[PDB]
Amino acid sequence: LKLPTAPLQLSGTSAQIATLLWQVAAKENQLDKVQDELYQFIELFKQHSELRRLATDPFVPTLVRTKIISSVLKDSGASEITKKLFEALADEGALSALLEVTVNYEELMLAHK
C-alpha cells in the first residue's frame, strides 16, 4: 500500500495521528472538510461540559465513551474520517488529544500550501 507523503515530518503520539489524519484526508481530497470538522470539535468541547467529560474524566466507562461519540456523529457531517478517528480516540481514551492533534494538522495544512 502507499499513502501520500506528509509535507513536513513531525514528532510522535499526537503529531503522529495528525500525520496519518492528513494522509487519509489527502487521498480523499478532504483536506479542508476534515480540518474544519476538527475546528467544530474544538468548539464543541467549549459548549458542552458532558462532551469534555468524555475526555478528562477517567471514571467514564469505555463502553459509554465509545457509544456516545458513535451515537452523536451520525447522519450529518460524517465524512468517514472525522467519524472513524473519533471512535478510535474514544476507544483508547485519547479524546483529550484532540487539541494537540488539531494544531499539528494545521502545520501540515500550511505546508501543503
Partner: protein, 434 residues
C-alpha cells in the same frame, strides 16, 4: 466478570468492567488446565487489578474469563484437616479424597486486637528437659529453631507435636514454607510411622495438619502458605479454644518468597535487596501468633541465617519477634546427646525470675554457669592434663558431665525405631531433678 489483561510471568493483570475486587481477594481463572487462583495485589486504575498467581501462568490468554470469589483465599479449617496435607489454596495434596471441612476461613485476617490480647506471659511446658529448664517456651511466643540436618530436628518437631497434644490438649499445624518436596515427603512418612499422623479410618486421631507450599510453586504460592498455616491454627485457637503449635518451617523462605513478590510487582528493593515491606510482611504474619482469651498459638519457626550474618535484615527483623531460640548443634549430637539442644547457645526471654520464679531461674542460671565453666577449660585439659587441675575444678567437670548427660531424654515418637520408651518430664520434676 473480569478478563485477563496482561500476563507478565507470575503477575497477571485482570480487567473488570464492573466493580473491582478488593485487594487480597481471590480470583479464579475460568477455564485452565490446572486450577489457577490469583490474589489481588493492587488496583492499577483503568479498571485493572494486578494479581499474583498461586500456580503457573503458562497457557494463559489475554481475554480469559476470571471469576471473582468476593473474598480472600478461603481454606478448609477444623478437625477434619488434621492428618491431611493441604496446599496454599486449600486443596488436598495427600491424595486421600476431599477435606472434611468444619468451616472455610479467609487466610487474610487482622491480628487480635489490644483488648483480646493476653497480659500474663506464662510458660508452655514441653516435656523436654533442656527446653523447659534452660530455654523455656512462652505460651503464645515465637521460637527460633537453629537446627539443620542430622541434629534430630524432625524428631524434635514430632515430639513437640506429641507432648503438646498429650499434655496441653492442643493440635499442631506444620507450615512447610518453600520446602523441598523430597524433604516434605520425608516429614509426611516420618509422621505416619511415629503416630502423629494416621491414615484411613483412624484419621481423626492425628495431631498435626500439614500445610505445604513447595519450592517449585510460584513465589505467590509460597508467600501465602504460611498464612494458610496460620488460619488452620487460628481456628483451633478461636473456635476450638486450644493451645496450638505452629511450625513455620524456614521463616527465611517466607521472607524470601515475599521479597520475590515485591520484586515482581515492581517495587523498589530496600537495604540488602529485601522488600521495603519486609518488617510489615513479616510482622503481619507474626502478630497473629499470640495468646488471646480463647487460646494461644505458639510457633516454632526454623530460622536460617543467610551469610552467617545475624545483622542481615531478614534474621534481624525476625529476631525482634522471637521470644526464645533453640539451637541444635552437631557437637552435642556427636556426644550421643538427644535432643541436641545446645545448653548455652539456646536463649529465652522467658528466662528471668519475674515470669518463671526465683527457684526455676537460679537452677537454670546455675546449670548454665557449670557448663560454661566446664567448656572454657577444655583447652587447658588437652595441653596440661586431666588429672592436672584442682579437685574443685574437676568437681565441676564431674558435675557438668552428669548434667550434660542429664539433658538427654528418650522421645515417645522415636520409640518405634530405638526401642527405648519415651518419657514426658514435668516441670517441677526438672527443677527439683536439676
Amino acid at each position: 466478570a473480569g478478563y485477563v489483561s496482561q500476563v507478565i510471568g507470575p503477575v497477571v493483570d485482570v480487567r473488570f468492567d464492573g466493580e473491582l475486587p478488593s485487594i487480597l481477594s481471590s480470583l479464579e481463572v475460568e477455564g485452565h488446565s490446572v486450577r489457577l487462583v490469583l490474589e489481588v495485589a493492587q488496583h492499577m486504575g483503568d479498571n485493572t487489578v494486578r494479581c499474583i498467581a498461586m500456580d503457573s501462568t503458562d497457557g494463559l490468554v489475554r481475554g480469559q474469563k476470571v471469576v471473582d470469589t468476593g473474598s480472600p483465599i478461603k481454606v478448609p479449617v477444623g478437625r477434619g484437616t488434621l492428618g491431611r496435607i493441604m496446599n496454599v489454596i486449600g486443596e488436598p495434596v495427600d491424595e486421600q479424597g476431599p477435606i472434611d471441612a468444619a468451616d472455610i476461613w479467609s487466610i487474610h485476617r487482622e491480628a487480635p486486637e489490644f483488648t483480646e490480647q493476653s497480659t500474663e506471659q506464662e510458660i508452655l511446658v514441653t516435656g523436654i528437659k533442656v527446653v523447659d529448664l534452660l530455654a523455656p517456651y512462652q505460651r503464645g511466643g515465637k521460637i527460633g529453631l537453629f537446627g539443620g540436618a542430622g541434629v534430630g530436628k524432625t524428631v524434635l518437631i514430632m515430639e513437640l507435636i506429641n507432648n503438646v497434644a498429650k499434655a496441653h490438649g492442643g493440635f499442631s499445624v506444620f507450615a512447610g514454607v518453600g520446602e523441598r518436596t523430597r524433604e516434605g515427603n520425608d516429614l509426611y512418612r516420618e509422621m505416619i510411622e511415629s503416630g502423629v499422623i494416621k491414615l484411613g479410618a483412624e484419621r481423626g486421631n492425628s495431631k498435626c495438619t500439614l500445610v505445604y507450599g513447595q519450592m517449585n510453586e510460584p513465589p505467590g504460592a509460597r508467600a501465602r502458605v504460611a498464612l494458610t498455616g496460620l488460619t488452620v491454627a487460628e481456628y483451633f485457637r478461636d473456635i476450638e479454644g486450644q493451645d496450638v503449635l505452629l511450625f513455620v518451617d524456614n521463616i527465611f523462605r517466607f521472607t524470601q518468597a515475599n521479597s520475590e513478590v515485591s520484586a515482581l510487582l515492581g517495587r523498589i528493593p530496600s537495604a540488602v535487596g529485601y522488600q521495603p515491606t519486609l518488617a510489615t510482611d513479616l510482622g503481619g504474619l507474626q502478630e497473629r501468633i499470640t495468646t488471646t482469651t480463647k487460646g494461644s498459638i505458639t510457633s516454632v519457626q526454623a530460622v536460617y541465617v543467610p551469610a552467617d550474618d545475624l545483622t542481615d535484615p531478614a534474621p534481624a527483623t525476625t529476631f525482634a519477634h522471637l521470644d526464645a531460640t533453640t539451637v541444635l548443634s552437631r557437637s552435642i549430637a556427636e556426644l550421643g546427646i538427644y535432643p541436641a539442644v545446645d545448653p548455652l547457645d539456646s536463649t529465652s526471654r522467658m528466662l528471668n525470675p519475674n515470669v518463671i520464679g526465683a527457684e526455676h531461674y537460679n537452677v537454670a542460671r546455675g546449670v548454665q554457669k557449670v557448663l560454661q565453666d566446664y567448656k572454657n577449660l577444655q583447652d587447658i585439659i588437652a595441653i596440661l592434663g586431666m588429672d592436672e587441675l584442682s579437685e574443685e575444678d574437676k568437681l565441676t567437670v564431674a558435675r557438668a558431665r552428669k548434667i550434660q548427660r542429664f539433658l538427654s531424654q528418650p522421645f515417645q515418637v522415636a520409640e518405634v525405631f530405638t526401642g527405648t520408651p519415651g518419657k514426658y518430664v514435668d516441670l517441677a520434676d526438672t527443677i527439683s531433678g536439676f
